Amino acid sequence: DTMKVINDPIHGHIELHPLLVRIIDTPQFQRLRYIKQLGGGYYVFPGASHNRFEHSLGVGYLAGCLVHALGEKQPELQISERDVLCVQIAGLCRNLGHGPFSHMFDGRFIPLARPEVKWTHEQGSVMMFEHLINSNGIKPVMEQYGLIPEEDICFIKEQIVGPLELWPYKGRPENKSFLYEIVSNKRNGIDVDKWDYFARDCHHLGIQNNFDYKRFIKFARVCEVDNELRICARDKEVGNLYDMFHTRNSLHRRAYQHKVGNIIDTMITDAFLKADDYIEITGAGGKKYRISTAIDDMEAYTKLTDNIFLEILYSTDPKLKDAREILKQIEYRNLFKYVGETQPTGQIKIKREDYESLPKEVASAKPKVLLDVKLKAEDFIVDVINMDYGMQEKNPIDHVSFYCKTAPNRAIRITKNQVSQLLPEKFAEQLIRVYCKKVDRKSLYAARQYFVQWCADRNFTKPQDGDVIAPLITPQKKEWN
Amino acid sequence: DTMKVINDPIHGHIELHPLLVRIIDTPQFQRLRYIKQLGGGYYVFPGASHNRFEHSLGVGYLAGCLVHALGEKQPELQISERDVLCVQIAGLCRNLGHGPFSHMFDGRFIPLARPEVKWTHEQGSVMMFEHLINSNGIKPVMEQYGLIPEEDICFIKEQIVGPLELWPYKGRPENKSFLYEIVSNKRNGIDVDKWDYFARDCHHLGIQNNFDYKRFIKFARVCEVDNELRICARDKEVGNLYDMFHTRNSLHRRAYQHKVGNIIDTMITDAFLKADDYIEITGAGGKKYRISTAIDDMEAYTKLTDNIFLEILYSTDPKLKDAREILKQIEYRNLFKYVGETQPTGQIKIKREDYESLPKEVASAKPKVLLDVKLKAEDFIVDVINMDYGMQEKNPIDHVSFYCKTAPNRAIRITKNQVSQLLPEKFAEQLIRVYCKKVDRKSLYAARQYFVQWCADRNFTKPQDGDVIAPLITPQKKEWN
Amino acid sequence: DTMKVINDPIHGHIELHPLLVRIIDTPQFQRLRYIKQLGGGYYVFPGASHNRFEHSLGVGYLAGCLVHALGEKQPELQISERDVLCVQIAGLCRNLGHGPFSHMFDGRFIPLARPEVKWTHEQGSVMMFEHLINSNGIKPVMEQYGLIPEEDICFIKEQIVGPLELWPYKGRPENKSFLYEIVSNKRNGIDVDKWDYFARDCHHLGIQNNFDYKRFIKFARVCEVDNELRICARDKEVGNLYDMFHTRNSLHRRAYQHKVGNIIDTMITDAFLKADDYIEITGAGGKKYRISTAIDDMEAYTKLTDNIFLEILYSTDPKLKDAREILKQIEYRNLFKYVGETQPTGQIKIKREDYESLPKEVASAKPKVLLDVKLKAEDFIVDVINMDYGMQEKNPIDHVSFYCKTAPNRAIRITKNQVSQLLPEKFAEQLIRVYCKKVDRKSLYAARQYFVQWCADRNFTKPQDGDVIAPLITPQKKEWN
Amino acid sequence: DTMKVINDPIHGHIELHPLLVRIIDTPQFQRLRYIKQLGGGYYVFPGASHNRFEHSLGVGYLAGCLVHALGEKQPELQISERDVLCVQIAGLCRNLGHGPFSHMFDGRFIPLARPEVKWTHEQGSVMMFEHLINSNGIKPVMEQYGLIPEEDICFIKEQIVGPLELWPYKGRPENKSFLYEIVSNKRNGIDVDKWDYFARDCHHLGIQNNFDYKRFIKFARVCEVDNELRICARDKEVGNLYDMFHTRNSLHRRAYQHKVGNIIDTMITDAFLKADDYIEITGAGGKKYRISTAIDDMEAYTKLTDNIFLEILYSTDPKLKDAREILKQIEYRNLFKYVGETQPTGQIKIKREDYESLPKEVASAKPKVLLDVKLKAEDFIVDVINMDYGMQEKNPIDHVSFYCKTAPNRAIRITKNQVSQLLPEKFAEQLIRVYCKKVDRKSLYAARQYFVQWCADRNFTKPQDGDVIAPLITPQKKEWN
Ligand SMILES: Nc1ncnc2c1ncn2[C@H]1C[C@H](O)[C@@H](COP(=O)(O)OP(=O)(O)OP(=O)(O)O)O1
Ligand SMILES: Nc1ncnc2c1ncn2[C@H]1C[C@H](O)[C@@H](COP(=O)(O)OP(=O)(O)OP(=O)(O)O)O1
Numbered sequence A, B, C, D: 001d002t003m004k005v006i007n008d009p010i011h012g013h014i015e016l017h018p019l020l021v022r023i024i025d026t027p028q029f030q031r032l033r034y035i036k037q038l039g040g041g042y043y044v045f046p047g048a049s050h051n052r053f054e055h056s057l058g059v060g061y062l063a064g065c066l067v068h069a070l071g072e073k074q075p076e077l078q079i080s081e082r083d084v085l086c087v088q089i090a091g092l093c094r095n096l097g098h099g100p101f102s103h104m105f106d107g108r109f110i111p112l113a114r115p116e117v118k119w120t121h122e123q124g125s126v127m128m129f130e131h132l133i134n135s136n137g138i139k140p141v142m143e144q145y146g147l148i149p150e151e152d153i154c155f156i157k158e159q160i161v162g163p164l165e166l167w168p169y170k171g172r173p174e175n176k177s178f179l180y181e182i183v184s185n186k187r188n189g190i191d192v193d194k195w196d197y198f199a200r201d202c203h204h205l206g207i208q209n210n211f212d213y214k215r216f217i218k219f220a221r222v223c224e225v226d227n228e229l230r231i232c233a234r235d236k237e238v239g240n241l242y243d244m245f246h247t248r249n250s251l252h253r254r255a256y257q258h259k260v261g262n263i264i265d266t267m268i269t270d271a272f273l274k275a276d277d278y279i280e281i282t283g284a285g286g287k288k289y290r291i292s293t294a295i296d297d298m299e300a301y302t303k304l305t306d307n308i309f310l311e312i313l314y315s316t317d318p319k320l321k322d323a324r325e326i327l328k329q330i331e332y333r334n335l336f337k338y339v340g341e342t343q344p345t346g347q348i349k350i351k352r353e354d355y356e357s358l359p360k361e362v363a364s365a366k367p368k369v370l371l372d373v374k375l376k377a378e379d380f381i382v383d384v385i386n387m388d389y390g391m392q393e394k395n396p397i398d399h400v401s402f403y404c405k406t407a408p409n410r411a412i413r414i415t416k417n418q419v420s421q422l423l424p425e426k427f428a429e430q431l432i433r434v435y436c437k438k439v440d441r442k443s444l445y446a447a448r449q450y451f452v453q454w455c456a457d458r459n460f461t462k463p464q465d466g467d468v469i470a471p472l473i474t475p476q477k478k479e480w481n
């Protein structure tokens, strides 16, 4: 084996170490070729055909770029080839646990199918990695290239999921703390995963990326902070970091939480729920699993991809009729209809335990308007989206360390007020989207009256088109006009 | 219904007439979301996740751009909204007939599975279109927007496949001949289909596109030629057209005929052949079809997509064991091994009827070299690739008409010698690639000796690495050194 | 004359009407080829070689695109070819009044050379346009293409500079009010001038543009607002518009107000001041003007371009020695040294009449630190930069009208709270940069102590590197640590 | 001093070693900011505002990239930091000798102004470099960073201009021969200068670049050839190299030799000739030089830039009236008129000594057509352009060495027949453009008849529009029809 070159449209010609090639050329990794990065987003942005596979290559490549750059600027860090490979592998492998349609699976489907369980793609990534290594005889190959499986496998997993439980990490000591900031940055979210997806998603979406990660890499240094060696950014680059998060939020607003992309994810989730009892996936020793239980056996999970969607759509089994009909409505574009969007007011905040009760509230609103049809709870979908800068109410730039050019080894902190008054005063918010499952003209007219009445009753913000869609409702509320 | 905007990364925001939206929002069209544009190319160029769906939107959009541009410059043509919609629809629908992995299906699989039949994706596109229209009640909608289904459906089909049988076309008269040059140009190959794929494939492959179709559109005019109204290009743009074909050939060399992408297509084709007797696809009236017979029923063909690959890979049926093993070798990257490439010499040309005999010739070559293993015909794959400028030996620019700025209505012809001495003297060639199905070191060493000996025996060109891979063979041939 | 095609790297092949070509092919327009768009920015961003000429073509092109798009969607507007040409000409010509190094000239040099006068590039553009028309016999040509010079010339000028004095405009009636929003939008700043420069500046700077103007054009409509017909944006696009201004501000922060680009502009301005008494420019009737007086005669102004810089640099006249020495320091990169940046606190705001007093305040600060040198007022430069969303304290989105898809003819308003909590709470701020003209190590050390002491005395924000550059000063201030 | 980062739109963030910064920040280098890369090309392609300065940075950067890549792949080469800096400096400095409007100066102006002398920009680059070093005290700084001025300055100059006189180079021994292939490749033309300009010129022109230099860098290796260590390319990349030269030729055809860009260069050259006796440039010791003699004194040459054009255009001196009038015709776009283009037939080849006689031949042609005006030799311009693959009749790929993957250290040769039949059979040709200085309708009509008659008399190829512009002339020639 010698090193391979891959041509990526985002990053150009990437060199892959033979050990990485060996990890990549497994069923567990190749699986990511059949999982769309953006799930239902492809049904709205037709350029978004890209899959988790190529994103993972890019994350692995950027992880290598950063660790290499730091080692070249600061030989005193003693970054070894072994460290580089471990960081690259963690980069490559942090998406292994994604399910069909990526975030739809762990964001919508598992929560509803297995409410008692707490599962994340991160957990899944660790499990799949363990399975990948064991199933494919990778430990010997790691040894051949100077890695120490006991320590290094632990390191890799900690990079992905954090401490598997003071310095809480075992795979590397505090002297190498900065290595944990590269692939999945638990402190402030600034990691090479974002950098690849910003660039790649934009390339495919037809939206232009505002963040320059190569510049950031050039200005990054390691400095001592509170007895840890941490990655620090040049002080004057602080604006670029606020911009990075602004970019992320804009991508969510325009693409990842697109009102129609979300309703398609919701419809697909509904079909999966209705198919769950009848689709069988063979795991370890020939034992059969369901869509919702494949997460318990990585052999089965390996075979759980976007292909599930087509298996359902092309099924003839009468058991799968209801699931198959939902997917067919997607193909004819007979989708649940968007009614509108609103936000809570003041401090008001909506908890996950209350999500299920919301369609019922909308249906209970009693607008003083003439209605041909009366709508029930089950006719309404209410999608609640938490938007933030990756840390709920917290400002992630308050968790970033900087250095100045006159003292490159001395870490400092920068407050929001030292940067600009034009920055946000809050860093988290909720959006509520309401959809109606009844798509005819009269139902939709009615749904609009309920929705706007409910906004008024709850003292939510005025929907943007409120006066046009519900002119008889909006005048009752002084604050709106 | 009103017009929709779609954001395409190649063309930007494209407007779609509601009738086009109706055609698009059918199972027959949406199917193209699950067929990779470049087939096995994705297994070499990881950016090439793109599917035929989005390419078809682009072709439909460009077809509209060109017909609109001509109408705006020359009102005297009397191009109607009806003409525009018909040309857009033909553009949208000329890829409907592609099968799993696009050109792998009609270029490799069908020729081997059903040797007696002549089938093309073009034929398939017409059949699928008819099925699309009838299955979805589109004729009434066409009438609602001013189309005349009898004439216009005929027109659309002729744009895709040519005369369904002097002026040989029935869907439009000679006065509108130029409309037939837009979507699928049978005279010289210069059409909007190429223009989309150059741009789109380059964007995804990470290769840069050298042809400017927007410029071409600006300089296009309709002029009278031999009692037909034909699209003519500005004389000075002739170099750009030679460049267009040069670009196409370069894309084939670098990407579409990549030696490994082709062997992957070949391996997938082999798996499909071994699965063909056991995979069943439900068509009209519940009747069951095979992969190779789904082309006879469009209802079944609608459900024949790349998903077949994963159906096989994830199968547990022992009948599909051999097919499934081939796909598993792809995932582990245990691929048939490339041995080398060579070309015929002089006038020598290789016909399709002789393809099957070639592995046998390679195995019959008797290199005077010491060999541990002896290889048989079935161990060798010989892939013969015809490279041309789209017209076999013919120069397509000899079939283009031009105009000069001093007389914009007067069509003229341009010879190669009026353009440049730096153009090719021939416009067609064949490449022969040889691969070995036995992948071990000793088999591959042997395969190299056979291959190079066979090249010498047949008086083919010297493989580039011939002296290195077969130093004991190459000296016998004077011409090579 | 017939229409010309120009290839622009930003917009592609642009068609120019022959009348526009005639306006372009004059000394008054061609002059823009020798004025850098970004002035001193080229000395920091080497890709920023671009000149106002090519920007002006782009603004003229986009002005045409928008007016065409509106006319195509709404024939009821009665937009004529005459209206289109007038809007294009205003677009082409709104940059005619720029001086050497663009905003350096009217932002720094004229204010200091002719403090009593109020001049702007806008005024200059009108004057230069009048001169262009009269000097080149353009009125007859305008008549030949259906324009009415009396009304249309007035219209064009009003599009550039606003009312030359209710409906305050004379060139077109209220029915055509929306035409005034295209080239230079006085109501909210959203115009095609921004759109070209975002795209063009980013292309040359090596920074990526976040705003999609083509999308905006597709969703724009004209609706009635307060008895005017105004351009309205689709409601859901409101986020994109906030993003547009965010992008503008980011471009200012990264490029247009780059600390070193600004000091170069300042040094060039200083050289121009020292050269002003000696450089002579011939205007009308052979009369001689100065750099600072060329604005009074358009014949002289025509010959006032970036070339002035080189005329000074290459001069041998001993009178110009001091000016020439400043420019030579630029070439050797011996620039005034950046000391730091800070901002006012709370409501504090700094007026233009106080700018001159600021170096004196810095020099008067008395840091308790050991200093080798003592610095004087004239050793300090204080640059005050007003950053906003184009309307001082005002939110420009409050001055935008929207429409919803259920009632496309009905204009509505959207408040900030209807959009997001993650938007700025303020829309204007000031940055203060301090530089030292003494560049040696000890002077700069001292300058840092004065600067930080002055920030502390004035209760400005703590400079980012304050603790590193002035560790003995920063502890006295509680608020900073 | 520490290393600086510059943001280039083509290459991104480039790091500059402090020694390079010191070389850059001199009047001799900064001069390149005022010399357009493409000369008169900007007057046809408005995006082509770029100057030689930024190109030189890119060449210096790519030179560094390649030498670094080779050192990283092959430590055994013993490439030192000293070698890297020398190669970077040669890259940075190979354009120092360009004059106003780049190739216009040494391609058109000097040959006509000083016919007896042989001068090239290469020679000029060496002289300017020597002047840069000596004028700015760079030798001590070189020593400070480990360079040995005696050997290294010699090396740098040899990289630029070749041997200043068996191994003919003195700055480095044969073991380092491959270092001479990087900045200016005298063996086959494949160097980093091309790579920058392809990318940069395309970015500005609005034409898309077909060559991937990063890929080439990845596949480059050093191998022994004929007792030299040379840079070798991977065998299979041979097609990419043919494509590189094809791209270069296409860029010449579309842009660098654009018929109107060339006539603008020609008109500027004419103005310079008429201004040459009156413009004075101060050189060493206050001595005065002319445009045409500034090449003899680098102090004067330092001040000779594109600014000369504006000095002439803005002059009031009656001596410069004729020169100034030519430039004014450019501004009004009253340009010499293109008549047509033709090529020699067979082996026919046109020598430089015969260029002056050609307008006289055109004027002597006696077309049997009715003419209002009779034209004289001085009314015609004949521009002869030699197009090749950089080596006259020779195929540069015959002078490239390759390696195969089975033996990466073993250099091999590849013939054209081993690559493709679709390649050119010849690698050089001449284009002849004829223009008329009399621009009225009747003169141009006449000029066309003379031109086509002269083509017929000389047995040149038929102009493309010949039948349209000269219908009464073309029938006499059988071969043409
Ligand atoms: N001319 C090209 N330009 C850009 N990318 C290319 C080109 N040819 C191939 N690629 C892409 C496809 C792959 O992603 C990557 C590696 O391809 P390539 O170098 O052909 O690998 P290979 O494995 O076929 O070569 P090798 O024969 O040495 O193993 O580069
Ligand atoms: N709701 C969604 N809809 C569509 N795509 C999504 C959604 N959520 C995430 N994605 C996609 C887009 C991104 O490229 C990618 C981000 O998720 P992932 O790659 O797991 O990193 P992450 O979990 O750290 O995300 P983040 O950057 O938000 O922290 O997944």
Ligand SMILES: Nc1ncnc2c1ncn2[C@H]1C[C@H](O)[C@@H](COP(=O)(O)OP(=O)(O)OP(=O)(O)O)O1
Pocket: B212, B215, B240, B405, C005, C006, C007, C008, D044, D045, D046, D206, D207, D254, D255, D260
């Ligand atoms: N082959 C090409 N590909 C891309 N852009 C080009 C090409 N040739 C020219 N351009 C650019 C340069 C100009 O901005 C614009 C117009 O060029 P061109 O068509 O040659 O005008 P022209 O005035 O010389 O031709 P004509 O003889 O038609 O008047 O296009």
Ligand SMILES: Nc1ncnc2c1ncn2[C@H]1C[C@H](O)[C@@H](COP(=O)(O)OP(=O)(O)OP(=O)(O)O)O1
Pocket: A212, A215, A236, A240, A405, C044, C045, C046, C206, C207, C253, C254, C255, C258, C259, C260, D005, D006, D007, D008
């Ligand atoms: N925010 C930015 N984003 C992208 N590129 C930038 C940005 N700021 C500057 N550049 C570019 C322009 C310059 O050519 C190059 C260096 O600029 P910059 O880092 O500001 O150096 P500088 O010398 O002004 O700062 P300092 O000397 O404090 O390090 O990078």
Ligand SMILES: [Mg+2]
Pocket: A004
């Ligand atoms: Mg390989």
Ligand SMILES: [Mg+2]
Pocket: none
């Ligand atoms: Mg919609």
Ligand SMILES: [Mg+2]
Pocket: none
């Ligand atoms: Mg022209």
Ligand SMILES: [Mg+2]
Pocket: none
């Ligand atoms: Mg700096």
